[PDB]
């Protein structure tokens, strides 16, 4: 379960499944005891019943907009630059895709106690 939770893409707390009770309905009486005189009486009766020149100089003002090296989790530049391939923005993506991309990993209810997880 801990490896499943580690490699899970999204964790929505409470991860423990809360106990669920019978929904309140008009089709059944919840008390299981007659609470009205009518119910009492009815139940009672029922019970008893060159061209191109290109500048090769290094644009030194541009280097603040580039990475200094390949960063940690990726081991090479091809992987790192593939991580930046598609924009997250609503201008460049569909609405559902934008929501999916901006969806965070750890999500919690705003005012509830988070518990240690139970054993399955």
């Amino acid at each position: 379960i801990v490896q499943q939770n580690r490699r899970a893409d999204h964790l929505i707390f409470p991860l423990n499944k809360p106990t669920e009770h019978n929904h309140a309905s008009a089709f059944t009486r919840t008390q299981d005891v007659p609470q009205t005189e009518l119910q009492e009486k009815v139940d009672q009766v029922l019970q008893e019943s060159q061209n191109v020149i290109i500048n090769e100089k290094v644009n030194k003002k541009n280097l603040k907009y580039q990475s200094s090296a390949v960063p940690f989790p990726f081991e090479n530049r091809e992987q790192y630059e593939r991580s930046l391939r598609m924009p997250i923005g609503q201008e460049w993506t569909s609405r559902a895709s934008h929501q999916e991309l901006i969806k965070p990993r750890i999500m919690t209810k705003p005012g509830q106690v988070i518990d240690p997880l139970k054993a399955p």
């Binding site: 290109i54 580039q66 990475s67 990726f74 569909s94």
Partner: protein
């Protein structure tokens, strides 16, 4: 993730691991990329409008024979009224500019009559009689501010027409432009200096010395905000504010470059020169596709519409070509089909302003209209298939209100792009530095590299290895000892001299043994 027909324009380019976390993360990244691209291409069902067209039914029907009166009678009344004609005989000729929404029009006479209007409403925002020579005008981020290139200095006016600024640093500018994401007003002119001014803060960002005399032409690349200037020597130069020298020099024409246009995708550029030559270039790969030679008269202006129509104005004429920007030689614009050859690209349309001269051209944004400025004012020609039918309301809204304009101003101001981000390739932001290592080096590998660098001096790998097979004429040790300074004597040069002597002795011994 079904494959789709229109997926190609939504595809993005990019410049076997043992790690399991990295493998799963890269698999998730690829899956999200494919899903996002397919779901973006799936939204073409939600496009509300379709582009216009002009199709001939018979073999005798030619599209260039169709007249503006016939088009105005055929099309609906709203577009017929949008095609407007203004007769302004006194202060001509008129250079015209449209807002990026296309809801406002800014005309500028040579004799100082500068007007800003809501052309579709018929409402005049501003009207100035400067009694002075005026060459160009442009709108700033809204219709609320506009810049006029007057006789010597460039002036900035508000919506009502009051002078806000007189830019002493911008001298004798003939060409004005605005980069709407960088808030940069770009001026070029008679001095041969390209100047970028920040209109939000008021600080002049760049002064670049073109060193090629007065600039004959100027266009912006809307894809990457690189300015294409045309000089009298026949070269188009590509400029970025962060570099003092041009990024690219293209030898386009023999004589002066009359005009430059760049398409919306930023992939194609058309130039006209004084040598009666119109050339269509690929920008990203910097080859030329087409070179129409010997036009009847030199083309004064080129414009390129959002759909990809190419408009050429030479004196009184305006001719438009459709699908002329493609790679194939069948797409080369021509004037006549020699006996009805279908491979020849005869003009999509033509119009003649008899007794007139076209001053400048501009396609109305998101409208099937081409505005022409000329000696007596402005005309709009109806061109089916010219403007982009489906706009995006987040970027540019033709039906924008006052509060939407007010919010969009602050939004764009907050997301103003710094001028140093302008490059030839817009996908350079976020990349690894080119001098940096392709693979990541950790502590162990960096320590191993440091140990190798320390042991290189002991192993003598710094100096070139002795090669007896290579002749002493081209030997690397000989070139090293020649390139080093003669007076200064160092240990490295001493070792190089000893190794060169040893290699020369070995080569002499081998030559003596052979002989």
């Amino acid at each position: 993730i079904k494959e789709r027909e229109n997926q190609n324009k939504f595809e993005r380019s990019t410049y076997q691991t043992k790690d399991k976390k990295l493998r799963a993360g890269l698999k998730k990244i690829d899956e999200q990329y494919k899903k996002a691209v397919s779901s973006a291409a799936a939204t073409d069902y939600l496009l509300p409008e379709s582009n216009g067209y002009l199709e001939p039914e018979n073999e005798l029907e030619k599209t260039f024979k169709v007249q503006q009166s016939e088009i105005k009678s055929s099309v609906d009344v709203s577009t017929a009224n949008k095609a407007l004609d203004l007769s302004l005989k006194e202060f001509g000729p008129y250079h015209i500019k449209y807002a990026k929404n296309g809801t406002h029009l800014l005309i500028t006479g040579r004799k100082g009559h500068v007007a800003s209007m809501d052309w579709r409403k018929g409402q005049l925002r501003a009207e100035l009689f400067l009694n002075e020579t005026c060459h160009s005008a442009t709108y700033l981020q809204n219709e609320q501010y506009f810049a006029v290139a007057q006789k010597k200095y460039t002036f900035i006016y508000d919506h009502e027409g009051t002078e806000l600024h007189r830019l002493k640093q911008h001298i004798e500018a003939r060409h004005l432009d605005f980069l709407p994401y960088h808030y940069l007003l770009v001026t070029a002119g008679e001095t041969g200096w390209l100047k970028y001014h920040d209109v939000s803060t008021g600080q002049l960002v760049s002064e670049l010395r073109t060193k090629a005399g007065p600039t004959m032409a100027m266009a912006q690349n809307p894809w990457n905000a690189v300015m294409h200037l045309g000089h009298s020597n026949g070269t188009v130069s590509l400029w970025s504010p962060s570099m003092p020298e041009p990024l690219v020099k293209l030898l386009s024409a023999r004589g002066p470059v009359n005009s430059i246009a760049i398409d919306r995708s930023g992939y194609y550029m058309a130039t006209t020169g004084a040598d009666r030559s119109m050339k269509i270039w690929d920008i990203r790969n910097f080859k030329q596709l087409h070179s129409v030679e010997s036009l009847p008269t030199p083309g004064t202006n080129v414009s390129i519409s959002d759909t990809g129509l190419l408009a050429l104005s030479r004196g009184p004429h305006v001719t438009l070509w459709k699908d002329a920007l493609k790679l194939s030689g069948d797409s080369k614009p021509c004037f006549g089909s020699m006996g009805g050859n279908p491979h020849r690209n005869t003009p999509y349309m033509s119009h003649l302003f008899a007794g007139n001269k076209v001053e400048n051209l501009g396609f109305v944004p998101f409208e099937d209209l081409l505005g022409v400025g000329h000696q007596t004012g402005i005309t709009n020609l109806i061109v089916p298939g010219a403007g982009e039918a489906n706009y995006d309301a987040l970027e540019l809204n033709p039906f924008e209100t006052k509060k939407q304009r007010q919010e969009q101003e602050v939004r764009t101001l907050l997301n103003k792009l710094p001028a140093d981000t302008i490059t030839l390739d817009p996908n350079s932001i976020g990349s690894v530095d080119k001098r940096s290592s392709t693979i990541r080096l950790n502590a162990k590998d960096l320590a191993q590299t440091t140990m190798d660098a320390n042991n290189k001096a002991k192993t003598n790998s710094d100096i070139p290895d002795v090669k007896p097979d290579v002749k002493g004429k081209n030997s690397g040790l000989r070139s090293f000892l020649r390139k080093k300074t003669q007076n200064v004597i160092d240990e490295r040069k001493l070792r190089v001299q000893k190794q060169l002597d040893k290699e020369k002795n070995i080569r002499k011994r081998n030559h003596q043994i052979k002989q």
